[PDB]
Amino acid sequence: NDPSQVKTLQEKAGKGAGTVVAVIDAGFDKNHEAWRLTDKTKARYQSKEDLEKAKKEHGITYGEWVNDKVAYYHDYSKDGKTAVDQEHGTHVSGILSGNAPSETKEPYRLEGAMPEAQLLLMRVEIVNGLADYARNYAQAIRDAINLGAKVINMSFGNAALAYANLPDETKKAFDYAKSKGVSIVTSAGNDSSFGGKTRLPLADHPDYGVVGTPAAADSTLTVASYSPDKQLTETVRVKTADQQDKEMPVLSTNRFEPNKAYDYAYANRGTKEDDFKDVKGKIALIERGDIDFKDKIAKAKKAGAVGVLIYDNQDKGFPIELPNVDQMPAAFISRKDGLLLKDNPQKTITFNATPKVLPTASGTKLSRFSSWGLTADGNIKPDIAAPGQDILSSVANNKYAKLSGTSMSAPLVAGIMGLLQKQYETQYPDMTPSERLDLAKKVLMSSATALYDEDEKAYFSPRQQGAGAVDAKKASAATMYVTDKDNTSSKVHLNNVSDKFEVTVNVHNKSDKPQELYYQATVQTDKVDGKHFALAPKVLYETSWQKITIPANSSKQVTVPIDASRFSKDLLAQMKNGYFLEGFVRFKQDPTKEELMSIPYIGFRGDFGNLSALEKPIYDSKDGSSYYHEANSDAKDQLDGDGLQFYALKNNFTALTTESNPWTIIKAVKEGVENIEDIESSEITETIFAGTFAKQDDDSHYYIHRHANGKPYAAISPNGDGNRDYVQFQGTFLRNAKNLVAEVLDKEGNVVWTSEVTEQVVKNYNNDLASTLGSTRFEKTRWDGKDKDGKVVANGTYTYRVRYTPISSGAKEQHTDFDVIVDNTTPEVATSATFSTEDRRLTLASKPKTSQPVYRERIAYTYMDEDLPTTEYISPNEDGTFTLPEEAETMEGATVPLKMSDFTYVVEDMAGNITYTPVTKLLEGH
Amino acid sequence: NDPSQVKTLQEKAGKGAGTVVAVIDAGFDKNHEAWRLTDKTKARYQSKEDLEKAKKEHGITYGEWVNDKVAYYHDYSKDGKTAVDQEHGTHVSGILSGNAPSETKEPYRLEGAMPEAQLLLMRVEIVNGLADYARNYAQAIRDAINLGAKVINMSFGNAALAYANLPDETKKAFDYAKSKGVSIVTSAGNDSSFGGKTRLPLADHPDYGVVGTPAAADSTLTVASYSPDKQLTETVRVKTADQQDKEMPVLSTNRFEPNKAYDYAYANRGTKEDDFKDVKGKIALIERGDIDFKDKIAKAKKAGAVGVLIYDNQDKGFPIELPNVDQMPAAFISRKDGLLLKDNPQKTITFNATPKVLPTASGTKLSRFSSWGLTADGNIKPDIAAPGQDILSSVANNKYAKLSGTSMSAPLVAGIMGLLQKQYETQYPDMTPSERLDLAKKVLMSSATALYDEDEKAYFSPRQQGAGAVDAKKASAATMYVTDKDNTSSKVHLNNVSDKFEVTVNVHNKSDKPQELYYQATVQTDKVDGKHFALAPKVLYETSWQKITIPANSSKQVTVPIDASRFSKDLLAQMKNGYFLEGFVRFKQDPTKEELMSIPYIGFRGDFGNLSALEKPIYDSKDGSSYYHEANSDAKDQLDGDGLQFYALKNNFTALTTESNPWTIIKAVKEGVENIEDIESSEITETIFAGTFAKQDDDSHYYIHRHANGKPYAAISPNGDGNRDYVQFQGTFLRNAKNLVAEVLDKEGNVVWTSEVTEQVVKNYNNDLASTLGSTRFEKTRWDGKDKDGKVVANGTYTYRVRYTPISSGAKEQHTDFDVIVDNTTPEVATSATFSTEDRRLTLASKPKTSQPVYRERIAYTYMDEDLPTTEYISPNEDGTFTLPEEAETMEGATVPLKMSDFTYVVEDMAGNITYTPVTKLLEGH
Numbered sequence A, B: 001n002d003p004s005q006v007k008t009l010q011e012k013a014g015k016g017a018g019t020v021v022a023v024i025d026a027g028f029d030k031n032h033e034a035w036r037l038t039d040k041t042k043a044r045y046q047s048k049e050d051l052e053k054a055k056k057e058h059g060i061t062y063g064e065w066v067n068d069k070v071a072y073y074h075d076y077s078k079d080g081k082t083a084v085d086q087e088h089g090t091h092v093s094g095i096l097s098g099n100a101p102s103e104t105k106e107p108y109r110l111e112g113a114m115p116e117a118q119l120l121l122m123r124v125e126i127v128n129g130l131a132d133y134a135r136n137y138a139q140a141i142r143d144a145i146n147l148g149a150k151v152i153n154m155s156f157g158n159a160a161l162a163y164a165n166l167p168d169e170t171k172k173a174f175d176y177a178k179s180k181g182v183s184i185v186t187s188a189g190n191d192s193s194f195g196g197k198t199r200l201p202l203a204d205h206p207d208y209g210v211v212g213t214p215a216a217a218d219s220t221l222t223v224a225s226y227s228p229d230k231q232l233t234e235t236v237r238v239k240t241a242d243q244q245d246k247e248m249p250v251l252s253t254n255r256f257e258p259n260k261a262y263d264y265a266y267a268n269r270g271t272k273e274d275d276f277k278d279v280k281g282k283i284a285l286i287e288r289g290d291i292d293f294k295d296k297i298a299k300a301k302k303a304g305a306v307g308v309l310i311y312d313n314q315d316k317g318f319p320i321e322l323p324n325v326d327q328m329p330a331a332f333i334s335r336k337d338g339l340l341l342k343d344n345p346q347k348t349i350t351f352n353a354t355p356k357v358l359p360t361a362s363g364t365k366l367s368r369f370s371s372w373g374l375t376a377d378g379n380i381k382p383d384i385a386a387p388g389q390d391i392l393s394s395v396a397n398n399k400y401a402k403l404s405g406t407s408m409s410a411p412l413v414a415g416i417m418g419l420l421q422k423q424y425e426t427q428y429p430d431m432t433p434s435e436r437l438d439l440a441k442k443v444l445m446s447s448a449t450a451l452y453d454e455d456e457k458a459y460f461s462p463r464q465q466g467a468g469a470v471d472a473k474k475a476s477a478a479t480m481y482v483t484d485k486d487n488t489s490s491k492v493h494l495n496n497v498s499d500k501f502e503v504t505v506n507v508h509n510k511s512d513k514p515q516e517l518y519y520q521a522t523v524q525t526d527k528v529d530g531k532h533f534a535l536a537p538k539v540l541y542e543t544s545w546q547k548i549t550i551p552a553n554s555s556k557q558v559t560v561p562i563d564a565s566r567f568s569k570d571l572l573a574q575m576k577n578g579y580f581l582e583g584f585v586r587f588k589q590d591p592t593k594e595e596l597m598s599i600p601y602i603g604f605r606g607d608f609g610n611l612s613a614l615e616k617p618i619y620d621s622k623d624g625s626s627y628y629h630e631a632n633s634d635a636k637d638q639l640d641g642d643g644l645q646f647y648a649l650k651n652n653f654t655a656l657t658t659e660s661n662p663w664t665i666i667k668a669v670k671e672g673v674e675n676i677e678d679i680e681s682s683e684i685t686e687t688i689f690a691g692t693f694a695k696q697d698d699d700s701h702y703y704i705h706r707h708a709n710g711k712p713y714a715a716i717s718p719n720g721d722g723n724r725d726y727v728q729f730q731g732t733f734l735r736n737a738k739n740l741v742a743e744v745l746d747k748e749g750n751v752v753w754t755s756e757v758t759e760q761v762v763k764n765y766n767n768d769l770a771s772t773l774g775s776t777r778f779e780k781t782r783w784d785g786k787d788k789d790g791k792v793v794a795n796g797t798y799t800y801r802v803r804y805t806p807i808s809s810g811a812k813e814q815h816t817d818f819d820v821i822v823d824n825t826t827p828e829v830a831t832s833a834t835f836s837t838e839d840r841r842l843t844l845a846s847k848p849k850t851s852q853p854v855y856r857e858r859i860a861y862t863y864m865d866e867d868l869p870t871t872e873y874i875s876p877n878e879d880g881t882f883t884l885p886e887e888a889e890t891m892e893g894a895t896v897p898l899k900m901s902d903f904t905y906v907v908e909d910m911a912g913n914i915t916y917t918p919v920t921k922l923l924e925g926h
């Protein structure tokens, strides 16, 4: 079980004896290691003393020690009250103790290729700001270096750091690590597509990679994990009708009885009752689907119980780790096999205690949601891929299956590069540590082999696999390597390209003899599924092999012309705003032999820098829906606001917000009332969307109102009463942006106001409280209807303009305009009315006169129901009169008499201008 | 225009000169009344002096003289701030003045058939309780009598008095008027069917009459209003194709210019532009429907129409008073006339100046929603019917069209009887005022002609028209009359009856000659439309005419056998809980001549007294719906409670209520924080329905949960924490009841607790804030889980029984049972847990162990989003662990870090037993 083939490298450079490896994480509780045994004490840090002395010569104070292997374990971001289990048995169990064996099924460790090296475990977590988490991290790596690690494995715990802007103490640490030839290695990420695992990016928005690691943290290598076409797995033997044994892969939760002969009974999907017809003593065989695992396992235990065998309902699916439901032993198996047992004559099986490396149902596979990413300048983010168990966990959370068993992929590559760099210390004695680190990185990427997606008959995108799957055997034997034209990077980025472009790479031959090679370039784009990217590769073509010879101790450039014009029409119909044209320039000794070297390249057929950064306003949605917001069918322009209880996860789209303030609160303020919190009325101040209005006869909903031209009726009355006084920008950003600023322009076109600027905008790549919500409200963009250093603007129509710039180099500034009406005209309403006691009808002396059309004209009254205030509203009759009830009924059956003094006439216009008048006032003499 | 034919009675008894007519009402502002004139000041009261003298002799210190007509006026309920105009113009415009002429199309007014009588106007209104209202009313009639009334018209303004229990004072007042031969007449009401004009009564609940006037009133006569087959009306004329003039009825709002030819154009229903294309300068002819009148008119005016003619979409509809929209002339016409105009080649019309008596489109008609009513003992409520303009108003309110122009019907009858009683002063010299009144009532009702409903080929139900339509001519000329078997009443009620029964009535011959007549009985029931009563009659059959001779000056009993067994099968299929068998015993001097006398009778084929008084609990609705509540298709079990803001008109059905109290408040109370609306949490105490629960992963709705037996999962944890501590009865009563009481029985059938009694229950005859809600919450029935001695009852299952008794005589007590489990077992939960800083999961050591099944098992935390606390909940993963986030994001894109001290483990079972433990507590070094 050696996928990356490190054997030859170890034979050549060793296994890390006398070396030190640093591992920085949020925690190491899940040791994975059997609390990692020990070794063969033959080099450095052989005792507390050994540590202390060095640790003191280097000016280090907080150093610890845990035994051999783990020669260090200081805890940064310490203060915060920690209580693992029993605290190592209460003070290390009276000093000297602590251990936990077992490492079954796990093929790789926290060293991969350097198992005989000591570890420096530095725990670092976010406690009191990223800025301080960053400084700890920087110190955490400077100490590793001063402690002599040469190899550092970094993980940022529970992410949420995507696009974070940390202090320069961080980048400073990285530069220093680079200067000393120390490698910093991190993981590429398993949830890297815009929208998250529960969604797919839209085909017209190709900028969908989400980089989890902050730019400042430029690690030596970012590595993606993948599942090889074969893996070390537990198994279960079965006898087929033809009378023969068939050993199959299985993932089990809870342990079965080693070597038995369990009987098994099919139960469909366990969604019905007759499904577990028996199961009496039979293991429940169930197909995945319709309902969740927890239930399948529970229903199985109800009946016969014993154990269960759930089989995937997807062909090339990853093995799923079942939940532990009442110690119930549950194992997961591929679909193929599942369908095999469902027909096997002898419904009997045996669980082998011998893990065996067998083919995988998935075959060579990278999760469709993993690694996707581009750097600010156009380079693909991931550098290389490495093997991992890659199992989908059904218990990471209750929202989606989280990819698991990938944490050991980056460390594997780290170990391999440490050994290769070591190999170079003897192979190229004159090189400095930095130079050896650079060479090792270039060779590792060049020699890495491009993974193939059999399922799509295409290579996995370099945006996912980087330069390819690490191959230690090739790296160690490598006497040549390929870089881009600049001779600095091991990846090529072309930025914007037309249908015809050239890819030029440089082959560096370090051997004393010329080398003959064959080269080709593969060309591919993205696969689309309707209006969404499928997150799968789409091969276009590959060039036919060309021969070239590189003279001894020299380098030669290779240029491969590419022409994908014949695919333009079809591809544009699927991805109208452009698409990627990417691939690999591959080299071989002979076209029939295996890939010797490969370097990835990527171009964008369009103008990537200028792709739209903001999702259009929901007002513009012909459907009423948006990427993160579902519309209400059977409700044209319904667009409720925050309501009485806001849900951060709802209404996440581009729009303008404003506030609704009921006349009751407005009046309470104009009077005195300090409290207002317990006023005898049921309405509250609410945040709503501009352009939306409640119905005359409220129905608890707000609706978008539009002008004859289709634009939303946005209007404010900046008169300080809090009712629709301002508009504020809320946006769903599809791409990162900078310098977001709002400005207001009058009819002429003059800028009368400019907001403060929001330096950085982070795209809304998900809609989750733990990472980022689907939209963001920008308070600095709020416009209260006033001009630059001045007063309220004059009534009229204005242009509320939101400006923002994509971060891509040279990107043009983008903007979205909203027409906003300003109007502070108080409504003119009747000064008198008459009331018919026989008719209970109030007749106003005249209709309301407002500058903006009438929004609502009602008669309000409030009555108590069990100390619970309730404000009722009366709409006008067809002739403009209002009928006033003589009473209101309580839910308990009590009659509440109503008098003229209980009623208040309220008129509100579209801009929120409002006037309220006691009906007694209208009736009195004049 | 004398539909009641009062001509012959007047030219034999006069027109009320020298008499006094009293009118008690809530107002008179609408009272047109041709006041001022009297053309013979030789009335009972000449000048203020004669009046002031009269009231001085009867201890009346209040009241004032006005006009030679209206010799007395007074407001028995001043104080409370009630303003009219400007005091007639600052003290009756200089003291002693006035004028407000404006009456047309009306052949009737106050005083009725006694235009020469003086008036006594008593203004009474509900002001500070119905008790004060009652006294004020009793006093008003007392003053009326002493001032020499003889006739008293009573109007209770805007009721909401249905089934009100007024003081024994009011009754004494009536008994006094009765003893003085003073008749008190009142209207039968135009909205008398269960559920209101907006609904229809259900066919399986035949007790659907709603009596608006309090029982402790009992007028001399309760008058129903009806539209005759011809009415005085303004008209319009058109030239038909035969070249002749066609004059048709019209009801106009605002005014068209008389004798001026107007062109008109058809606009369909005016529900779509282009409809008004050829309308400019013409009258828009528009059909009723789809949109409201106001909009059809506004659209017409915008299109340049000079007025509109709206025609009915109903064939026998009442004319409709159109709304005044910007003074637009608007006239309403029948369907037939509208179709005639639409199809007329010469589209020119002229509005005539002189009104005219013309056939009505409705024909003889009683509103389908009017009069329905029975008294407690089973008598039909209405006594007689009288003509009115009966016009539907589209501006009375904004929910339904209100029948108008019925106010003069009762006063008309009052005047007729006043005259008949005067007539009896001469003939029948020794009778006493009391005996004259009783004879007048008998003759008036016997003489009344049973109205025929041509549309249904059946007589209108006696429950609507009483003894028939008043006919002063037959009344005045009558020398005979029929009464029930006794001589007490002029109405017959048989209570419960089988298919075969007989009706016996007494004919009284006051003549000196033998009288030969023919008689028969009509038999009818209710017309049904699917699941509802159509509020229309269903004729069954009429008996063959039989002969009888009544000797001079004597009485003779007449019996008519009724056999409707032939119809039971069908009728029972439509009205399964029984149906009425009613009709009239009619008398003629010749089967081919007109009706001379008729007396109504009514029986109920079934057991009326024991009809179900309470709608079954919503839990039992297969649909999820009830009479006043529509279920949610797609979720029959959804049953939300009051929520964040209760709606008096929603969720009105029979059920049990309880309360939900979040742990945050339970904790805040258990600790001691005064003022609960300050706590840093978003949830609040909510009223919900027992048997309902939120989902583990809250979706903002509550759902009914049921035991396997199908009963709602009603459970309480009587431990004083406010969370599901009690159950309270909420009922939608279909019939009035008395002595409502709740009791709880243990498994043994023993009563362990009894609630206070709720003496009277008024049926929920509507779902309207101004009259009655669709259900009533009975707080006295609240059970907090304690027994008769304040001791919390033991955990177990109990029967929450609600008992109540219909008001019908002999009715058995009915009851509804609800199974309620009581369980105060505190949940037992893990006391320790381990948290993985790596996986981010919190693993609990054990449990949860609860007595009742688990309701919700969650981890909560609250963060701020702009000084707005928001409590978030995390559900467990499929293996029982919980994943805890590191941060929460604000809507403004800010990061709110989360630490262990922020999380709380909360366990709640089905009875509301709950436990909450800080996650830090569970971690507390174990």
Ligand SMILES: [Ca+2]
Pocket (backbone or CB within 6 Å): A716, A717, A718, A719, A720, A721, A722, A723, A724, A725, A911, A912, A913
């Ligand atoms: Ca305002």
Ligand SMILES: [Ca+2]
Pocket (backbone or CB within 6 Å): B716, B717, B718, B719, B720, B721, B722, B723, B724, B725, B911, B912, B913
């Ligand atoms: Ca409780």
